[PDB]
Amino acid sequence: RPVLVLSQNTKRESGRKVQSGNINAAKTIADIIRTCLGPKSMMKMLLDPMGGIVMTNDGNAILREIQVQHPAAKSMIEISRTQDEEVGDGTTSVIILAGEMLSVAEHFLEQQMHPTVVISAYRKALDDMISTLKKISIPVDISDSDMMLNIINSSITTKAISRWSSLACNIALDAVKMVQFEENGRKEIDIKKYARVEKIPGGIIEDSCVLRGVMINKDVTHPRMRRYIKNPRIVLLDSSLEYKKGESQTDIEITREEDFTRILQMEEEYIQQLCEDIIQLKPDVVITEKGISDLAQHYLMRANITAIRRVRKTDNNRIARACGARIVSRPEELREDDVGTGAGLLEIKKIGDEYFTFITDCKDPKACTILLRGASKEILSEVERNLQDAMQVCRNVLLDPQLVPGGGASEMAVAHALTEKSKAMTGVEQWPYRAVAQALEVIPRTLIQNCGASTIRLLTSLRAKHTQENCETWGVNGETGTLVDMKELGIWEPLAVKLQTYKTAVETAVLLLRIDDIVSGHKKKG
Amino acid sequence: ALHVPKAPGFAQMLKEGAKHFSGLEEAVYRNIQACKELAQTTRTAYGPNGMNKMVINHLEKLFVTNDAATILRELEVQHPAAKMIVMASHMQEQEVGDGTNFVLVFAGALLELAEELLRIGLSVSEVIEGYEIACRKAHEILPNLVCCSAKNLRDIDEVSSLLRTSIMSKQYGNEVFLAKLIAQACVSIFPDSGHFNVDNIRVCKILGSGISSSSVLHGMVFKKETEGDVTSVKDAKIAVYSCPFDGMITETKGTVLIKTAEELMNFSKGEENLMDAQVKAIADTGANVVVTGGKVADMALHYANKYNIMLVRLNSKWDLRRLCKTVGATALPRLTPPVLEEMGHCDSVYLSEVGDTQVVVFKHEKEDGAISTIVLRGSTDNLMDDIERAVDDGVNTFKVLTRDKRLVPGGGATEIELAKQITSYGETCPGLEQYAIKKFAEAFEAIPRALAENSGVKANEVISKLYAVHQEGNKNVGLDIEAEVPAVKDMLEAGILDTYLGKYWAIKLATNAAVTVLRVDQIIMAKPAGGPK
Amino acid sequence: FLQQYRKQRMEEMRQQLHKGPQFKQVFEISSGEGFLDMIDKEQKSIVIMVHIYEGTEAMNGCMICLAAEYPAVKFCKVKSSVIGASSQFTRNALPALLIYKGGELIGNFVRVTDQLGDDFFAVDLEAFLQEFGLLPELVLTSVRNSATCHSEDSDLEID
Amino acid sequence: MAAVKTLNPKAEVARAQAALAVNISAARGLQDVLRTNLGPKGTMKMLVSGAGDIKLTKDGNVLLHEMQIQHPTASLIAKVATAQDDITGDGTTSNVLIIGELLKQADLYISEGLHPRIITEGFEAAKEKALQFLEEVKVSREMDRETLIDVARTSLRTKVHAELADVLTEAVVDSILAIKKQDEPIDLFMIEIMEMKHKSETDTSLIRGLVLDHGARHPDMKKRVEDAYILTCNVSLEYEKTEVNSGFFYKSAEEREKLVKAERKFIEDRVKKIIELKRKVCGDSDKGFVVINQKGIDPFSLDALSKEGIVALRRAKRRNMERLTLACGGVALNSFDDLSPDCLGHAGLVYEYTLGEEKFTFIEKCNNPRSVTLLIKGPNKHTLTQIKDAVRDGLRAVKNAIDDGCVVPGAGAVEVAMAEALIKHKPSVKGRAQLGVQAFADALLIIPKVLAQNSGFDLQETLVKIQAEHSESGQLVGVDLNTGEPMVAAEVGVWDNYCVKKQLLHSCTVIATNILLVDEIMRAGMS
Ligand SMILES: Nc1ncnc2c1ncn2[C@@H]1O[C@H](COP(=O)(O)OP(=O)(O)O)[C@@H](O)[C@H]1O
Ligand SMILES: Nc1ncnc2c1ncn2[C@@H]1O[C@H](COP(=O)(O)OP(=O)(O)O)[C@@H](O)[C@H]1O
Ligand SMILES: Nc1ncnc2c1ncn2[C@@H]1O[C@H](COP(=O)(O)OP(=O)(O)O)[C@@H](O)[C@H]1O
Ligand SMILES: [Mg+2]
Ligand SMILES: [Mg+2]
Ligand SMILES: [Mg+2]
Q1: Among partner residues D87, D266, D333, which is closest to A264 by beta-carbon distance?
Q2: Cα separation of D68 and B36, whole Å?
Q3: At a CB cut-off of 8 Å and minimum separation 6, what does B325 contact?
Q4: How far apart are CA B168 and CA A382, in angstroms?
Q5: From CA A179, how far away is CA A234, in angstroms rounded?
Q6: Separation CA B496–CA B168 (nearest Å)
Q7: What are the φ/ψ torsions at residue B62 (nearest 5 degrees)?
Q8: D527 inside 8 A of chain C by CB
Q9: CB hemisphere CA count around B419 (13 angstroms)
Q10: N- to C-terminal Cα distance for chain D?
């Protein structure tokens, strides 16, 4: 009955109150994980709607389990995910920084400053921040194992795994080092596909190790298969070793007595032919992604070959990388170079009440399995997340060997540099420029607040210290609340992580400042 | 100040529908009360004067019986402790066949006296250890109480006399006739080999003429009619086929492919000639009866009629196997003629009507065979069902007698002697287990007490007389049912005897159930939800 | 013991990692006419699954996980008070996985907490549905590639 | 109020001291329920499922699984106990008790304003020192039969009553000794556990062979074989159809009969191969032939086999192929392409026993089986379940004893000694972590307290007696459950698995440390 120029379910709101609501929502998101930053962080228990429980202090892991309604909160969560995917660390820092810059921008928006002016000042500040960060960086020789281990330690010193720091650092460094690869002049690390982490609850955490090979949750197809082979010649397949129908419609028509027996005998002979083709290469282990018929098992066992079936494709690729094999679909085309020599041992041992297949003496493997053994499943999941952070940090350092001081030292150094820059602006954008520069102090401030020490006196002391000449590495000790030189404490983090954090924080602030109207309720119109 | 909050800890974490009963009074005493209630429920159906109960299950079926195991099965007991006692009773029923009500009564008495001992101050462990000591003592004493043995099992008279007591608790009025029937049926079975198979006794219920017309048949009876025109033979030569009485077909897919008119015109004639040749080949062996487990084709039936072959079609595979055992045939898998050794032989196979039921009878003139059938007559379905239960009890008693031939006096003689000797022993042993041992002995009084209550006389007088008579040294004395005043008589003379194995297993299972119920201290019940099956 | 569904755990861990950009939430229907014209729209081949509620949380999470891992299907939920059913339905017939495809009923399960249990997970319900043949039978892009496909003027080199 | 509830109005958040209060209350509730389980003198619990199934249990893990609980902290503790049971198989009640007491002791100092991180640092230092002490105190010893009997007694007496435990000890120890090969890992899959429901619970025993839950499906087959050749095969002897949609085409009835007869030639070939092998190996009637098949056998093949005096079983378990290969000694065959007497096992007696509607086949009197079976016999289903759980615990205990070269004194003696060592070491810990060390020692002392309490004696007085005796004598004295006086558990014969204790320390410390550091709990995954 009503004329309804727009749909009845369309809620529209605009003006200063929209900007205030957006900035408040961003501040609330930042406040969610404010206390999860620093070496003295506290974990949080998250109740998954599916019944699971997540106990972690990672920024992205926490922000991933929140269902929000305000679109600004959705933007903040997407920022967290972007930071986690791009570099792997600094997820809490980017959220905190975005909240702080949005707050200091709201301060100006309360006055009569147009948001575009604030955005322009923010972009100028971001350029100067990048320049200063690149300036105060230091080179790192990646051939030094101790330096890489120290970098990884500073990466995971704020996580629950920091208690077993040496073990975790060595695991991450070894995995990243031996997943490195180069073909046709293209270099890669590829932690996502290779370097899998398999967690088996039970045992002790110190028993965790990185294998010179891979381990899969599989057992031999037949009891008489050998469960321990010294130097296997592994052969990997995709095709089934069964007798299956073709793609076409191939009905038969039987009129003679012996045609049924002939058909069955030809099925058996086809299986025998396939197994003979495989045997021709003299392998020791046969792994396939699909089924293996029982007759095929008998024919393989006649030749003393261990067979494993129904192995996932990702695991098969990992095995191919580890033992230097090639996956072949048609056994009749099995070249010699497709046989995997290099696996220095194959052993199907039993852990707990399950059978696990170990290929753990590969000579120069290009893939690995990180075997985690811990108290429970949630502890192991948190340990896996921490190990992922460590491996991502190691890869970032290997790609870009630059380092910057940590513990809020880089933030204060950049803030002082931009504050000195702003003394010559003489424009109207000098105020937002200075404000966003000083918004970087939220990281040392949060570190001090989590440490428990007095915030105001320590920030004043640090700011005074950074006003001197050679003080770019002076930061705050995270677990004692004391100013310290960070070339003495030994806390550093990759330059790429810091650059990504600042870029993403400023870009989020700009994106949310560009908005002054919200329209909601309309249908998707699919 | 108007509400009591749930205590912090486990009380709050419990789910909505769950219940947690913990402690002595809240768990042990409630379990004991539930078990006592179950025993009181089934008490009145104990002994020859036990009264039948009409039980209607959730499927509206009506049960009229005094067999304790059947009553408990048809009742749907919900209390877990009473469920445990019912499990004990059913295990006794499966292991022996008779003595379920004794198990239930003894377990109820034991748990009642256990509650009394817990209230007087004894701990649960002390009660349990006293009960176990007394159970061991009773099992040691029991062989000494054996009065007389079976000493013969091929004799019709002795078997009937022995089985009388088992099937006089049920169907008290007319037990001699049922004893004779079951004795004949059991003696027909049970060859020179010591093994006796309970399933070899078959029971057929045909309505109409009261249970006094029931008879024993040395063979099998099937409530159905013959397929063919022939209805009776006198020198049967049954040939049993487990295959359908039709031309065998392929297993993948049969397709008749016709490419010329001649094939089309000759196909049906050739098929009919083949079937005729097969049936003629079967008949040429002298087989004048053909029993098939599968369906009967029309042309096959016509050719069987032409050659004077009686056709019986048995639906049940168990029925086919039982018929093969009865006649001595072999279930052939093809329609091939049977060789000499696979030919079943029966004295006579005929179609007859009993009451208004058409039945086929595989009768043997010899007083022997592998399977014997008890054709039960009656005027109500429930009456024949109860008679069938009595028959099962008698057959199980015969099986137990084959396993062990020792018998102990019934009518409370064995229970009272056991109680007397266990009480005498319990005074000797010092310590806190003497109370439990004495209570275990006293629990045996629940059997003669139940018998006296059901017979309608004062139980205390009967128990006192039993103690006196046993004090002068007669251990074969039990209460006299055939009297309207408290009286006792020698049970060995009267032939009121029950199997030693029955008493042994019943005591063992009842003690185990009572002890296991006592062991439970805390109960955590989930929300009932559903679960019809 | 292949009857024990060893793959159930493996599928559970596969479904644990739903997607990258969160796993969304089940759409709630707040109008009877909304329910009607939601069934009316979409093509016939598109499968729509409906839940009626007031053991519901676990199955709701199961639908969330399935819709995250089965983008083709259109899992949705509605309150029993929105439709306004009878006393018996609003009392003892709440959990009912209602399945629609093309406007005709295909799955009319009711009181699913009995035949599906109460502690069942996403894989349990997924197998229960797939054995019925009711659930229809892929790399992850960066974020997106396509904006619009309207002009076929792409590339040419006429002399 | 909270930021989360601002973002998501229907969100449950417990922050700051609320998180600790919730977690510690849940842990204390679980501890209060599971206190009565510890020790052989603990009480039994009857657990009734929704369907009405009765389950009597005293095992900690089983009780955790079947308590109607919906708490997050209880879920974490249950996961820890599940891992503990899966790997070691014993120590779940102790796990829960130690976690609960650790949290209670930590809260005792946290409620005085102390930060949880200091308590966790003390916990880690104490755990390191306790592990060193446990390494010092373990009793390395070659484990002959009697030591294994003592370990199995120490487990099974806690799980079941006295005589049943005494039977089960001999059963499990003999089974482990039978299946164990020198200097090789033990495969517990080779000890089949079969359930029967006809005798008393004390009739359960060990069969030096194998027991199958199925028998011959042909009435005419032999029910008992004296001297047996065992043919473990995995070939489908039933009729199988063509994989490429064959179908038949005939033009007359006679042609149809020819096709029907000739369509079973394939399976008849394998049946005839088996029959020829049987005729070759045993030309008399004294020796029997048994064919156990993992796949089905159709009635025609059953008849053909039974005509030759061959007893055949079908649909065998997949694990039973390996079990029969290891017990009888044959070779499991996936085809009859080339079979000889070499691939035949042996069994000195094969017979079946009929129980109700279930047929059980026995294979006994093997030469030297490397795989045996345990026959659980009891009157009730819940009795069988309880005996099965007890047997699992005992088998795990004996296997753990065999794997480790050492065994550890029990009855809480090691807990008392470790607490004393931690108290002695406390001054060397710098800072306020001494409070955490003291809390860890007091938490370790829960086990003797609970043992004394369940035995009925006074808690504090018994514990102080034990501590005084250990301090004055230096021996590893634990709680005597009949008198309350200290007793040397090594001399009496109360042994504990070293691996179980090590796992207890590690897992309890890790989970308690993680729970203490949780500052707030959230649930905002809705709407
Ligand atoms: N021991 C320490 N003392 C002072 N600052 C530290 C210490 N360890 C780490 N930091 C600082 O804390 C930050 C790490 O916090 P973290 O919880 O890892 O945030 P995110 O997870 O977002 O990277 C880094 O910026 C680093 O400079
Ligand atoms: N004529 C009799 N006089 C006295 N007691 C009898 C007589 N006949 C049977 N009994 C007693 O009845 C008991 C049988 O009761 P019954 O109803 O069979 O219970 P259950 O089936 O559990 O054995 C036996 O213990 C026996 O001693
Ligand atoms: N006969 C005994 N005397 C004294 N202590 C015992 C005895 N048997 C077992 N214990 C103690 O009881 C504990 C076993 O408790 P148990 O019920 O097995 O808990 P869990 O099942 O979690 O291991 C062990 O620490 C052991 O020291
Ligand atoms: Mg970090
Ligand atoms: Mg009776
Ligand atoms: Mg134990």
Answers
A1: D266
A2: 29
A3: B200, B370, B371
A4: 73
A5: 20
A6: 9
A7: -105, 130
A8: yes
A9: 24
A10: 19
For A282, half-sphere exposure in the C-beta direction (CA atoms, 13 angstrom radius) is 3
Contact between D422 and D437 (Cβ < 8 Å):
yes
> How many Å lie between the alpha carbon of D220 and the closest alpha carbon of chain B?
9
DSSP calls for D411-458: TTHHHHHHHHHHHHHGGGS-STHHHHHHHHHHHHTHHHHHHHHHHTS-
Q: Which amino acid is at B334?
A: R
CA distance B319 to B331: 12
Q: How far is CA A212 from CA A235, A318, A343, in A?
A: 18, 12, 9
Q: How far is CA B302 from CA B229, B274, B315, B467, D211, in A?
A: 9, 13, 21, 76, 51
Q: SS3 for D327?
A: helix
Nearest-CA neighbor of B157 among B186, B200, B189? B186
CA distance A334 to A320: 15
Q: Mind telling me the catalytic residues of D?
A: 59, 92-93, 393
Q: Establish how many alpha carbons lie within 13 A of residue B20's alpha carbon, considering only the half-sphere containing its beta carbon.
A: 14
Residue A25 contacts by C-beta under 8 Å, 6 or more apart in sequence? A68, A70, A72, A73, A76, D7
Q: After which residues is chain B broken (C to N over 2.5 A)?
A: none
Pocket of ligand 1 (CB under 6 A): A 37-39, 41, 59, 89-93, 157-158, 406-407, 447, 477-479, 491, 493
Residue B355's region, left for phi above 0, alpha for psi from -120 to 50, else beta, is: left
**Positions at the binding site of D:** 39, 90-94, 158-159, 411-412, 496, 501
B100 sits in which H/E element: helix B100-120
CB contact under 8 A, A163 and D124: yes
Task: Name the token pair of D33.
Answer: 């329920």
- Cβ of residue B448 lying under 6 Å from some atom of ligand 2: no
**Cβ-proximal residues to D5 (8 Å cutoff; 6+ apart), any chain:** D11, D13
CA distances from D375 to A120, A441, B191, D315 (A): 82, 72, 32, 21
* Residues in CB range of B193: below 8 A, 6 or more apart: none
Burial class (CB in 10 A: 0-12, 13-18, 19+), B195: exposed
Nearest-neighbour CA in chain D from A52: distance (Å): 9
DSSP codes joined into one string, A250-297: ----B-SSSHHHHHHHHHHHHHHHHHHHHHTT--SEEEESS-B-HHHH
Burial (Cβ within 10 Å: 0-12, 13-18, ≥19) of residue A517: exposed
With CB atoms and an 8 Å threshold, state whether D51 touches B249: no
Q: Indicate whether residue B46 lines ligand 2 (CB < 6 A).
A: yes
Chain A: list its partners (3+ Cβ pairs within 8 Å): C, D
Ligand-binding annotation for B533, yes or no, is no
Question: Are the CB atoms for D405 and D136 separated by under 8 Å?
Answer: no
Is the CB of B530 less than 8 angstroms away from the CB of C118?
Answer: no
Q: Which two tokens stand for residue D391?
A: 């047997």
**B348 sits in which H/E element:** strand B348-354
> What sign results for the dihedral spanned by CA atoms A246, A250, A256, A260?
positive
Collect all residues with Cβ–Cβ distance below 8 Å to C21 and sequence separation of at least 6. A78, A81
From B263, B508, B523, residue closest to D48, measured CB to CB: B523
Q: How many helices (H) and strands (E) does chain C have?
A: 7, 5
- Does A81 contact chain C (CB < 8 Å)? yes
How many Å apart are CA A201 and CA A205, to the nearest integer?
10
Tell me, in angstroms, the distance from the centre of ligand 2 to residue B170's CA.
9
Residue of D413, D439, D446, D425 lying closest to D513 (CA atoms)? D439
Contact list, D527 vs chain C (CB under 8 Å): 25
- Structural contact between residues A286 and A305, judged by C-beta atoms closer than 8 angstroms: yes
Amino acid at A467: T
